[PDB]
Design an enzyme around this catalytic site. Sequence first.
Site, short mmCIF file in Angstrom:
data_model
loop_
_atom_site.label_atom_id
_atom_site.label_comp_id
_atom_site.label_asym_id
_atom_site.label_seq_id
_atom_site.Cartn_x
_atom_site.Cartn_y
_atom_site.Cartn_z
N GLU A 1 0.84 -1.20 0.00
CA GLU A 1 0.00 0.00 0.00
C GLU A 1 0.87 1.25 0.00
OE1 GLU A 1 -3.81 0.35 -0.60
OE2 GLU A 1 -3.11 2.43 -0.84
N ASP B 1 -6.09 9.55 -2.03
CA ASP B 1 -6.14 8.16 -2.44
C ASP B 1 -6.60 8.12 -3.87
OD1 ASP B 1 -8.84 8.97 -2.13
OD2 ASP B 1 -9.46 6.84 -1.86
N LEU C 1 -7.91 6.49 5.81
CA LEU C 1 -8.76 7.55 5.30
C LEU C 1 -9.03 8.62 6.32
CD1 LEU C 1 -10.71 8.47 2.76
CD2 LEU C 1 -12.35 8.26 4.61
N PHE D 1 -8.00 -4.51 3.33
CA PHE D 1 -7.50 -3.16 3.30
C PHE D 1 -7.61 -2.57 1.92
CE2 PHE D 1 -4.79 -1.03 6.52
CZ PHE D 1 -4.85 -1.95 7.57
N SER E 1 -13.63 -18.07 -4.94
CA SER E 1 -12.27 -18.05 -4.37
C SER E 1 -12.31 -18.13 -2.91
CB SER E 1 -11.49 -16.86 -4.74
OG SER E 1 -11.86 -16.50 -6.07
N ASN F 1 -8.07 -18.83 -9.53
CA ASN F 1 -9.29 -18.14 -9.52
C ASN F 1 -9.09 -16.69 -9.32
OD1 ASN F 1 -11.85 -19.11 -10.39
ND2 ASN F 1 -12.74 -18.36 -8.51
#
EC number: 3.2.1.17
Length: 164
Positions: A11, A20, A32, A104, A117, A132
């Site tokens: 990230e 973002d 955030l 996240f 999945s 998958n």
Amino acid sequence: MNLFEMLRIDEGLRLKIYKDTEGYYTIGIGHLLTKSPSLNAAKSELDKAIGRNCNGVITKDEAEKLFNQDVDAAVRGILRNAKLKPVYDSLDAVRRCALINMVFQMGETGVAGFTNSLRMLQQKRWDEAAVNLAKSRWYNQTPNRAKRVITTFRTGTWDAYKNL
């Protein structure tokens, strides 16, 4: 290795407020601040969050603490989720990180919508799951991050992070 680094790498860690992907106000490892399009608001929220007048800038230790907050929150939604819980419950630690990384990345809802999945992971069909997951829009959006995460599901190790 830890979530911290993993996320730190996938990230990224920002020490000053920023916009973002989509546009909101975030800080550190994708924290955030506000949805609001006001910097001032962001600031103020940071200040509340941090507990000091920051002026839009925090220290890494600061970003870490935010991060470790953001985590346990993620985990809670996880464990308070019908879909995610069982899956998570059944994953090994390294494997949990990957789920968390995912949560996240796209929030509790996004993750919970990978019906199949998730099922596989739950089943311990690592390769199947991986292939998958290898076909989601997700994967196509953020391939590098995705590949790393997926590899971790498959391998169940940090190997994908070892030599970056």
